[PDB]
Design a protein around this ligand. Structure first.
Ligand SMILES: NC(=O)c1ccc[n+]([C@@H]2O[C@H](COP(=O)([O-])OP(=O)(O)OC[C@H]3O[C@@H](n4cnc5c(N)ncnc54)[C@H](OP(=O)(O)O)[C@@H]3O)[C@@H](O)[C@H]2O)c1
Ligand SMILES: Cc1cc2nc3c(=O)[nH]c(=O)nc-3n(C[C@H](O)[C@H](O)[C@H](O)COP(=O)(O)O)c2cc1C
Ligand code: HC1
Ligand code: SF4
Ligand code: SF4
Ligand code: SF4
Ligand code: SF4
Ligand code: SF4
Ligand code: SF4
Ligand code: SF4
Ligand code: FES
Ligand code: FES
Ligand code: FES
Ligand SMILES: [Zn+2]
Lengths: 571, 630, 151
């Protein structure tokens, strides 16, 4: 910690050595514009829109310039403003401008910068960008709106370590493409959605399914049911002017009821069911002591990565379905018979903060259990379209009999929650007594680190457990495990860094501390429930005693389990 | 070709090579350069050797090799590099007659052998006759082209077989490294600094400062890179340097590696140059076989290895970080600074990147001393430079002059005036990154300071001369189009502004220009220069800005009057019908799709400039051809 | 495919060094005439480099092309010393006679156009180099006779 002296706009500043001009001037309440830099990535130097003027009189980029003693910097001289205006005019001279038709309307950064830096008349009119738009599955790519900032390539290469996309061509005709413009499905993409989360323009977007939902609601011979993800209730309020991490569960239930859905449920019931199934499977595997370690299967992107890159780990993957598909099977196989509705006349809609769920819902092995999948942004758009005000709503509760949940299933939206809940159930199953007091929380698996390791002692038996949030950390853990350095018993993997609260379907943010706020909100929501264990749920016991009669039973194995196949297209 | 284990053994074998060379009597040199090879010098050599074999000359050989040291040959046939005067190749020299022959034809070989070889005579019809004066010159040095040239880097060029190492040894080479191996690194570095050497790649950054900075770094591994990309069209200096004597640059690279302490090095060459890469690989393999490259060189303990990396295109790959990325195997996109390549370059290790010409001059400084070198040229910039002058000039070739010679005698005295007795207009210095110099500034001496003062840059070193025939707007458009084509497209300013400027220039040159375009062009150039990332976009608008500064009247005529003063823009041609030479053929009226010409038969016709498309169909189709492009 | 053995033949020669993707691409182009798709995928599988990097490198440089060419490739200088003396008219004559733009081939036939800049000889007016021989001084009228001589 050694400090340096500098003058920014006539004000003395104390910053540590190595800090750039941008981070040094941030402490004076000055925001320098920039489009190609993000808090997760190294500086690139492509937009050239953050230039400042030093004492000599030259323009220098302030995003990758280290600080020095005795430096004089000017940030709002007329020359800098003129250069920024010219650069933005150069960008906007070759933009296809359907801001009426653009999904990123009122959320674009190029539009906001064009407004703020006072552009009203483009002098450069001529050749534009013109390409062809092709379907890439659940991701929509329009190369006519690209500004070539490299954020998607950098996030896919530096952080995710997948390297599914790169630059193509050179000069005015450069663009982002997969090898030979092949569709993303058979490329090395695993459908995590982090590239869609950082794009500053409307080039990368989502595939919408709202029209099918509206045409199924208007159908007078169908019943529509909806399920809500645990992580949607802490980030939905951001779209309506609230702070991150504020619970809007009752408001969102009331809004969904006002939208026309006949029955509103939650996925945490399926989360408890999956917890019970997985804990029973883990106990049986530990008794047998075969096929170690055991990996979870709740993340579709992790399953895709296993199928594509590591096809030798398939026997070690847990066969339990994800909570979404389990809920779909429950609704279309048990609830319909109780109510008296034919299987062909029931519609199931899910609201998820993920993008791999859109692809997962269309897999042939699930027999079309879930008919449509939405995101948080799509739900917010629907709520705003219908005209409901969100601030002044009245709190309501979930429907019956698949609405009540516990606290162990409320922390699946953050990294390490699934492991904590599994340990909570496994301690009770193995020992027979219930944890009381502060022993319920396992503080050794909480945080935002890369690889988290722990050793929980259960009545004299020690289990080696691990958690790895992120694809890169997952690859590192796999390399560590395969070499035989150490042996584990249960491993969790999540494709997004920080858990499902950082998914590609969450509302856009500008605060650099959204992860901490959302994690705090999730933990606070967990702390305010009457039940904190999965086996204390009441409707799960009824479902077992009425339809399946035992976990891992023949009917359960037929309807609540799945199998995986290798997708490795050898070349 | 046995291995060597002592420094003195090299000088011991030098005397044997000298005696073997002295055993010869007659030597003939033929230019093996690309320009002369395009004229058929290989066929000339084949015919000459065939005639010598027929004439009973049993001792005739082409290449001087290790087995040739024991053979005494009465007549020797050589194949050297580019001799410098490419205007009237092929070039042949006969010794000890000292006769300089130009335009040698295979069917003249028999007469040359009969007279120049057997009779010791000269044929005036094959000697150089300057059309300006008519005087006949015999010796090469007596030629006015070579009179003003002080060849220092090209001292061995044109007289040493590039494919033979023993020939290089016989000329005194490989002694600078032997002398340096007995001295300390600091002595060599300080000698280089005192020599006043500066980079020949255009930037002008001192070499001694970079070498000291590399020396002060305590790292296990260091690298050296030799740059021979030559992305500038019209410049063929390092091409001829590599095709003439790769051993000089190899010796310079070894000296630099010893000075800074690096055991590895690379030579970046473009794969488009087959002769250069073949010669470099042959020289490297010969040097490795001889034992001068590898481990424990001459029993000292110095280790060095050399590698060749063939280039694959882009003009932007010459930039230092782009070059390192291309060597590693990625896209040649420049990265952001700091850090610089002198602290962490190739594979995050310190590197030293220099030009071919810079590495070629190190052995001369080592042998003769830096104080002798510093006595030539301006005190702030010593040494000499190699210039490749071409264009609309009488004599084209590779010239070498002391650094500081005035431009007027460079253009006129050496170049022999302007061809076709036209009037000089301007010269382009530096290539696409340089500016345009009019006739009013021909009295300017050449050095970094004066050229930087005048808005131009040294550049690669290419000189192009243009006369009054060419249009300046079209020249600027051509340079802008080349810059647009050679961009890489990473940052907004270069990628967008270059195409915008090209569009504006095309609009101006097609006759659709509007008032106020010059100020917009100047603003775009200023912004692009100020806010670009690498050095390619910062120097891009220089040809346009210089042309605007010096030839604004051309732009004014093109925009306001819709007329081209030089008559080179087709879209602004204004055909005129001469009443005197017209016969009323009416072919122009018939063949023109729009028919802007209306008139009576057997009478002169009138051209309506409003309804004309200026496609040239009228002039080329009428037999009289009275319609002239005015 | 039987060419996967030919690929493996050079995957062991020019791949003992560090960072030799461009050399491998050049050797593949030399052997196969052009640069195909399954060869890229085989290189990606057998070398570890993801196919996106290889595709980007191939699409960066203009030397590499991913489509078969003709037999006789034509090159025009279009340099700073030949553009002055009417090389553009030579290129226009070639385009008019062959019916194909520069950089595009007549694959049905065996001809091809190219835009290689500043060949070795700069003193021989504008310089058109077909295949492996140098022409020298050129005029828009010699185009017809030279094309007739080859065709
Ligand atoms: N065809 C040609 O020959 C041609 C064409 C266009 C332009 N140019 C010339 O090239 C110039 C731009 O060249 P460039 O941008 O590549 O080089 P540059 O930034 O001008 O600097 C030239 C040299 O300085 C080196 N260097 C190392 N340590 C340094 C330090 N501490 N401070 C400063 N420099 C250091 C640079 O390496 P790093 O940059 O790797 O650090 C590089 O080798 C133009 O201005 C133009 O004059 C030449
Ligand atoms: C666009 C561009 C092209 C360049 N091309 C070359 C080149 O062909 N040869 C060369 O020696 N230097 C070139 N340079 C300069 C190199 O960056 C490098 O500075 C030079 O090789 C340094 O050698 P020096 O230290 O001897 O000057 C180029 C720079 C730029 C920006
Ligand atoms: O399926 C499932 Fe679930 O370790 C998981 O994963 S957590 Fe959910 O806050 C939902 O819907 C979310 O997001 S229920 C899923 O993705
Ligand atoms: S979805 Fe994930 S893997 Fe696919 S391109 Fe985007 S960041 Fe890469
Ligand atoms: S697609 Fe989006 S993130 Fe990727 S380069 Fe284009 S604008 Fe940037
Ligand atoms: S990307 Fe931004 S600027 Fe472009 S059309 Fe969409 S909202 Fe408008
Ligand atoms: S971690 Fe959650 S949001 Fe991210 S890919 Fe997996 S399921 Fe989707
Ligand atoms: S200035 Fe031009 S050549 Fe240089 S990095 Fe930017 S776009 Fe590429
Ligand atoms: S070409 Fe000559 S003769 Fe024919 S119409 Fe024109 S001026 Fe008259
Ligand atoms: S080209 Fe113009 S001048 Fe000639 S015939 Fe046609 S319209 Fe008349
Ligand atoms: S944010 Fe600094 S160059 Fe883009
Ligand atoms: S190539 Fe023969 S004189 Fe230059
Ligand atoms: S400019 Fe034509 S070959 Fe060099
Ligand atoms: Zn003109």
């Amino acid at each position: 910690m050694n400090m340096v002296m500098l003058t920014i706009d006539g004000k003395q500043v104390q910053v540590e050595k190595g800090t750039t001009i941008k981070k040094a001037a941030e402490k004076l309440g000055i925001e320098i514009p920039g489009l190609c830099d993000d808090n997760d990535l190294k500086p690139f130097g492509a937009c050239r829109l953050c230039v400042v003027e030093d004492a000599r009189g030259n323009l220098v980029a302030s995003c990758h310039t280290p600080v020095r003693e005795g430096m004089v910097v000017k940030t709002n001289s007329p020359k800098v403003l003129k250069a920024r205006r010219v650069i933005l005019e150069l960008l906007l001279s070759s933009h296809n401008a359907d801001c009426f038709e653009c999904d990123k309307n009122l959320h674009c950064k190029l539009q906001k910068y064009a407004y703020e830096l006072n552009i009203r008349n483009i002098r450069f009119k001529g050749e534009k960008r013109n390409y062809e738009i092709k379907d890439n599955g659940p991701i929509y790519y329009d190369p006519n709106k690209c500004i070539l900032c490299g954020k998607c390539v950098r996030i896919c290469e530096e952080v995710q370590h997948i390297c599914a996309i790169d630059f193509a061509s050179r000069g005015f005709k450069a663009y982002i493409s997969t090898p030979f413009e092949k569709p993303l499905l058979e490329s090395d993409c695993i459908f995590c959605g982090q590239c869609v989360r950082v794009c500053p323009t409307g080039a990368l977007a989502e595939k919408t399914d709202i029209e099918r939902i509206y045409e199924a609601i208007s159908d007078p011979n169908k019943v529509v049911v909806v399920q809500v993800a645990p992580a949607v209730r802490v980030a939905l309020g951001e779209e309506f002017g609230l702070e991150p991490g504020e619970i809007v569960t009752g408001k969102m239930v009331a809004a969904l009821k006002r939208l026309g859905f006949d029955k509103v449920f939650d996925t945490q019931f399926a989360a408890d069911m999956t917890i019970v199934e997985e804990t029973a499977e883990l106990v049986e595997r530990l008794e047998k002591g075969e096929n170690f370690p055991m990996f979870t299967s709740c993340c579709p992107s992790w399953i895709l990565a296993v199928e594509k890159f590591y096809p030798e780990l398939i026997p070690n993957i847990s066969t339990a379905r994800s909570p979404q598909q389990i809920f779909g099977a429950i609704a279309k196989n048990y609830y319909a018979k109780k109510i008296g509705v034919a299987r062909e006349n029931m519609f199931v809609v899910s609201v998820m903060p993920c993008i791999g769920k859109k692809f997962e819902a269309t897999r042939p092995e699930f027999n079309n259990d879930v008919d449509a999948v939405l995101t948080t942004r799509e739900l917010a758009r629907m709520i705003k379209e219908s005209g409901i005000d969100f601030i002044k709503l009245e709190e309501e509760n979930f429907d019956s009999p698949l609405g009540e949940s516990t606290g162990a299933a409320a922390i699946f939206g953050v990294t390490g929650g699934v492991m904590e809940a599994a340990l909570r159930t496994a301690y009770s199953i193995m020992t027979g007594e219930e944890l009381e007091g502060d022993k319920i929380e396992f503080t050794a698996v909480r945080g935002l680190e890369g690889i988290k390791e722990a050793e929980v002692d259960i009545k004299g038996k020690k289990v080696r457990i691990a958690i790895a949030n992120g694809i890169g950390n997952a690859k590192k853990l796999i390399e560590k495990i395969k070499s035989g350095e150490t042996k584990y018993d249960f491993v969790e993997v999540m494709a997004c860094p920080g858990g499902c609260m950082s998914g590609g379907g969450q509302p856009y943010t500008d605060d650099p501390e959204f992860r901490k706020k959302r994690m705090e909100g999730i933990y606070k929501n967990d702390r305010n429930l009457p039940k904190r264990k999965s086996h204390e749920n009441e409707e799960v016991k009824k479902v077992y005693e009425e339809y399946y009669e035992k976990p891992c039973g023949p009917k359960a194995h037929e309807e609540l389990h799945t199998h995986y196949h290798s997708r490795k297209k050898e070349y | 070709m046995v291995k060597l284990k002592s420094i003195q053994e090299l000088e011991n074998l030098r005397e044997k090579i000298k005696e073997a060379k002295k055993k010869e009597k007659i030597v003939i040199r033929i230019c093996g350069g690309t320009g002369c090879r395009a004229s058929g010098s290989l066929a000339v050599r084949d015919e000459l050797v065939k005639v010598l074999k027929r004439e009973g000359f049993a001792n005739v050989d082409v290449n001087l090799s290790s087995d040739c040291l024991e053979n005494t040959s009465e007549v020797h046939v050589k194949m050297t590099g580019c001799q410098g005067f490419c205007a009237q190749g092929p070039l042949m020299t006969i010794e000890p007659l000292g006769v300089f022959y130009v335009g040698v034809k295979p069917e003249d070989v028999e007469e040359i052998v009969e007279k120049s070889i057997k009779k010791n005579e000269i044929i005036e019809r094959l000697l150089y006759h300057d059309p300006a004066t008519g005087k006949t010159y015999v010796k090469r040095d007596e030629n006015p082209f070579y009179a003003k040239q002080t060849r220092l880097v090209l001292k061995h060029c044109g007289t040493v077989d590039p494919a033979s190492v023993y020939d290089y040894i016989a000329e005194g080479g490989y002694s600078a490294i032997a002398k340096a191996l007995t001295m300390d690194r600091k002595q060599i570095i300080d000698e280089v600094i005192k020599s006043g050497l500066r980079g020949r790649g255009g930037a002008g950054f001192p070499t001694g400062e970079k070498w000291l900075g590399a020396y002060k770094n305590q790292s296990p591994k260091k690298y050296i890179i030799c740059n021979g990309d030559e992305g500038d069209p019209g410049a063929f200096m390092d091409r001829s340097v590599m095709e003439g004597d790769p051993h000089k640059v190899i010796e310079g690279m070894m000296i630099g590696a010893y000075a800074i302490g690096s055991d590895e090095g690379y030579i970046y060459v473009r794969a488009e140059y087959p002769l250069a890469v073949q010669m470099l690989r042959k020289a490297i393999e010969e040097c490795e076989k001889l034992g001068l490259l590898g481990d424990n060189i001459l029993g000292t303990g110095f280790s060095f290895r050399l590698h060749v990396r063939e280039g694959a295109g882009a003009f932007v790959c010459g930039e230092s970080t782009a070059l390192t990325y291309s060597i590693e195997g990625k896209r040649g996109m420049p990265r952001v600074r700091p850090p610089r390549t002198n602290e962490c370059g190739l594979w995050e290790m310190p590197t030293v990147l220099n030009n071919v010409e810079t590495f070629a001059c190190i052995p001369e400084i080592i042998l003769n001393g830096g104080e002798w070198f510093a006595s030539i040229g301006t005190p702030t910039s010593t040494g000499t430079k190699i210039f490749a002058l071409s264009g609309k000039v009488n004599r084209t070739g590779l010239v070498e002059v002391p650094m500081g010679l005035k431009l007027r005698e460079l253009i006129f005295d050496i170049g022999g005036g302007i061809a076709n007795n036209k009037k000089f207009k301007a010269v382009q210095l530096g290539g696409p990154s340089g500016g345009c110099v009019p006739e009013s500034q021909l009295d300017l001496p050449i050095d970094f300071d004066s050229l930087s003062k005048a808005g131009a840059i040294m550049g690669s070193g290419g000189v192009v001369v243009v006369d009054e025939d060419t249009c300046m707007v079209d020249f600027a458009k051509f340079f802008t189009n080349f810059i647009v084509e050679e961009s890489c497209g990473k940052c907004i300013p270069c990628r967008e502004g270059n195409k915008k400027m090209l569009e504006i220039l095309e609009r101006i040159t097609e006759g659709k220009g509007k008032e106020g375009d010059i100020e917009l062009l100047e603003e775009l150039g200023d912004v692009i220069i100020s806010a670009s990332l690498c050095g390619l976009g910062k120097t891009a608008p220089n040809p346009v800005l210089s042309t605007i500064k010096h030839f604004r009247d051309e732009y004014e005529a093109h925009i306001r009057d819709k007329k081209c003063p030089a008559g080179a823009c087709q879209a602004l041609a204004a055909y005129k019908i001469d009443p005197g030479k017209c016969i009323g053929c009416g072919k122009c009226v018939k063949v023109c799709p729009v028919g802007a010409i209306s008139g009576e038969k057997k009478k002169p016709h009138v051209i309506d400039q409003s309804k004309c498309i200026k496609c040239g169909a009228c002039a080329e189709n009428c037999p009289k051809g009275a319609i002239y492009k005015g | 495919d039987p060419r996967f053995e030919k690929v493996d033949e050079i995957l062991s020669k020019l791949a003992n060094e560090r960072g030799a993707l461009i050399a491998i691409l050049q050797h593949v182009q030399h052997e196969f005439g052009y640069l195909p798709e399954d060869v890229i995928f085989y290189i990606a599988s057998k070398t570890g480099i993801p196919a996106s990097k290889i595709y980007g490198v191939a699409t960066f440089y203009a030397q590499f092309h991913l489509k078969p060419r003709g037999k006789y490739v034509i090159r025009v200088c279009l340099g700073t010393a030949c553009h002055v003396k009417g090389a553009n008219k030579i290129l226009a004559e070639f385009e008019k006679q062959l019916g194909i733009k520069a950089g595009e081939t007549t694959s049905d036939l065996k001809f091809t156009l190219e835009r290689v800049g500043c060949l070795g000889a700069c003193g021989l007016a504008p310089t058109v180099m077909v295949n492996e021989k140098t022409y020298g001084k050129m005029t828009p009228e010699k185009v017809s006779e030279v094309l007739k001589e080859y065709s």
